[PDB]
C-alpha cells in the first residue's frame, strides 16, 4: 500500500511548496493521478485476498471503498475552492492538508490487517473531521456539532478498544487473516453479551443506527461542503466496513443479539424516511436520507447471508456517490441564496436547466431506479431479508414507497413550480459546478455495466 500511502503524503509538500495561485490546480491534478493508480487494486482472486505485507491487505470489500476514497479527494477540492476563495493563503493550505490527512487515514484504515491498527486509524479520522467542521463550518452551532460528533463516536469506540485488547489476550492475535482460522464460537453468557455489544456499538454509532443517529443531522447541517461529502460518502462506511469484518468472530451469538438492532433498523428506516417528508432544511433532509439508507446496510450485515453482504457492499458504494452528489447539488444552491431552507428557492429548472438534469439524475438514483447500482444493492438486501422472515417485505416495500415520495418531493419543491420572485442572483451554473456533478453521476451509472467489482468478497 506504500504505492498509495507515499504519494498521498507527498500531496502535503506539493500544496505547501506550490505557487500561491496554484494550490487548487496542483492538488487537484495530482490527487486525480493518485485516484487513477488506485485501479491497480482490482487484482483480486477468487480464493485468496491480496495480502501485501504484515501490515496491509486488500480484498474485494476494501478495494471499492479505497477507490471511492481516493476519487472523493479531488472532488472535495473542487467543491471547496469557491467558498474558500477569500480565506487566508496559509489557511487554505491547512484546509487542503486536513483533507489529505483524512485520505491518508482512510486508505490505511481500509487495508490494515490487524484490528488494533484499524482501530487507531479508525479513530485518527476524527481529528481532521472535527477540525474541518469546527474551524471551517459557517454557523454558531458548528461547535456543538463537533462535540456531539466527537463524544458519540468515543462513547462507543472506547469500549471497542477494551474488547479488541481482550480478544488478543484470549486468541493471541488480532490479525484478520489469523482470525479467519482461529475463530472460535461465542457461547451464551453475560460476559459474551457485553463483548458483543462492545465490538458492535462503535460501528453502530458510525452507520448510524436508528436511535444513535441524532449526531449525524447536526454534523451535516454545520459542516462545510467537503466535510459533508467525506462524512456521507466514506466516514459513514467505516462503521459498515468494521461490522463486516468483526462479525466473523461473533458467531453464533449474532443469531439472537441482532434482534434488537434489526428491529431498530427495520422500523428506523420507516421513521427516518417519513421525517424526510417534513424537513425544512435541504441538508438535513439529505442527512436523514443517509440514516434511512444505512438502516438497510445494518440489517444486511446482521443477518449474515451471501446475498445480504453482496447487497450491503453495493449500497455503501452506491449511497456514497449519491449522497455526496446530493450534498454538492444543494450546496450549489446554497452558494447562491446563502440558505439551506428547501422552500426558499423554487422553480429552479426554469433558471438553471442543466442543473435540473443533475437534480433529476441524483434523485432517480436516490430512490433506486433500476438498473442503477443503488437498486442492485437495495434489491439484494430485500431478497435476503425476505428469506430471513417473509413479513419483512411489508416494511421493505413501504420504505421504497416513502423513499420515492421524499426524493421527488425534494426535486419538485426546489426545481419545479414557479420561481421565487425576489431571488434575482441565480447565476448560470459554472463549469466547475457542472463538472463536479458529472464526476459523481458518470461513475455511478458506469458501474451498472460491471457491477461485480462492487459486490464484495462474497461475489
Amino acid at each position: 500500500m506504500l504505492k498509495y500511502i507515499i504519494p498521498t503524503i507527498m500531496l502535503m509538500p506539493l500544496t505547501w511548496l506550490s505557487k500561491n495561485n496554484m494550490i487548487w490546480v496542483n492538488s487537484t491534478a495530482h490527487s486525480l493521478l493518485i485516484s487513477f493508480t488506485s485501479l491497480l487494486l482490482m487484482n483480486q482472486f477468487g480464493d485468496n485476498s491480496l495480502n501485501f505485507s504484515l501490515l496491509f491487505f486488500s480484498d474485494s470489500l476494501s478495494t471499492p471503498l479505497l477507490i471511492l476514497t481516493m476519487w472523493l479527494l479531488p472532488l472535495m477540492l473542487m467543491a471547496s475552492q469557491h467558498h474558500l476563495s477569500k480565506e487566508n493563503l496559509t489557511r487554505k493550505k491547512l484546509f487542503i492538508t486536513m483533507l489529505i490527512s483524512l485520505q491518508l487515514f482512510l486508505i490505511m484504515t481500509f487495508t490494515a490487517m490487524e484490528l488494533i491498527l484499524f482501530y487507531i486509524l479508525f479513530e485518527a479520522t476524527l481529528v481532521p473531521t472535527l477540525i474541518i467542521i469546527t474551524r471551517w463550518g459557517n454557523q454558531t452551532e458548528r461547535l456543538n456539532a463537533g462535540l456531539y460528533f466527537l463524544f458519540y463516536t468515543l462513547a462507543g469506540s472506547l469500549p471497542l478498544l477494551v474488547a479488541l485488547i481482550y480478544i488478543q489476550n484470549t486468541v493471541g492475535s488480532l490479525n484478520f487473516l489469523m482470525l479467519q482460522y482461529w475463530v472460535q464460537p461465542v457461547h451464551n453468557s453475560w460476559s459474551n453479551v457485553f463483548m458483543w455489544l462492545a465490538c458492535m456499538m462503535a460501528f453502530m454509532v458510525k452507520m448510524p443506527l436508528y436511535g444513535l443517529h441524532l449526531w449525524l443531522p447536526k454534523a451535516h447541517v454545520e459542516a462545510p461542503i467537503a466535510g459533508s461529502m467525506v462524512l456521507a460518502a466514506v466516514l459513514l462506511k467505516l462503521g459498515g466496513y468494521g461490522m463486516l469484518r468483526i462479525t466473523l468472530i461473533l458467531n453464533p451469538m449474532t443469531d439472537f443479539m441482532a434482534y434488537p438492532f434489526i428491529m431498530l433498523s427495520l422500523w428506523g428506516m420507516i421513521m427516518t424516511s417519513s421525517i424526510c417528508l417534513r424537513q425544512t432544511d435541504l441538508k438535513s433532509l439529505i442527512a436523514y436520507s443517509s440514516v434511512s439508507h444505512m438502516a438497510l446496510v445494518i440489517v444486511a450485515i446482521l443477518i449474515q447471508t451471501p446475498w445480504s453482504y453482496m447487497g450491503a457492499t453495493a449500497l455503501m458504494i452506491a449511497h456514497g456517490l449519491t449522497s455526496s452528489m446530493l450534498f454538492c447539488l444543494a450546496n450549489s444552491n446554497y452558494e447562491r441564496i446563502h440558505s439551506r431552507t428547501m422552500i426558499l428557492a423554487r422553480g429552479l429548472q426554469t433558471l438553471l436547466p442543466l442543473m435540473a438534469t443533475w437534480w433529476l439524475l441524483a434523485s432517480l438514483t436516490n430512490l433506486a431506479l433500476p438498473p442503477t447500482i443503488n437498486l442492485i444493492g437495495e434489491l439484494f438486501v430485500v431478497m435476503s431479508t425476505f428469506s430471513w422472515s417473509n413479513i419483512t417485505i411489508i416494511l421493505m416495500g413501504v420504505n421504497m414507497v416513502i423513499t420515492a415520495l421524499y426524493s421527488l418531493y425534494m426535486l419538485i419543491m426546489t426545481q419545479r413550480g414557479k420561481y421565487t420572485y425576489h431571488i434575482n442572483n441565480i447565476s448560470p451554473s459554472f463549469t466547475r459546478e457542472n463538472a463536479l456533478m458529472s464526476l459523481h453521476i458518470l461513475p455511478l451509472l458506469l458501474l451498472t455495466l460491471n457491477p461485480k467489482i462492487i459486490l464484495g468478497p462474497l461475489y
Partner: protein
C-alpha cells in the same frame, strides 16, 4: 617469679591450642532455600521483534 605484663600485652590477640572440635553449625541453621535457576545461553534477537500488536520490529 611473676613478671608484670607490659602496656599492651593483655590486649593482644593470642592463639589457643585446644583439642575441642570446631562446631559445625553453631547457629543451628536450617537448610538454605535452593537458588533460582541461573539463565544461561547466547542472547539472540527477539523473535519477530517487540510483538506489540501490529509492530513488525
Amino acid at each position: 617469679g611473676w613478671v608484670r605484663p607490659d602496656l599492651g600485652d593483655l590486649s593482644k590477640v593470642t592463639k589457643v591450642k585446644t583439642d575441642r572440635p570446631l562446631p559445625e553449625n553453631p547457629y543451628h541453621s536450617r537448610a538454605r532455600p535452593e537458588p533460582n535457576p541461573e539463565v544461561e545461553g547466547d542472547l539472540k534477537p527477539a523473535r519477530h521483534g517487540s510483538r506489540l500488536f501490529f509492530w513488525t520490529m
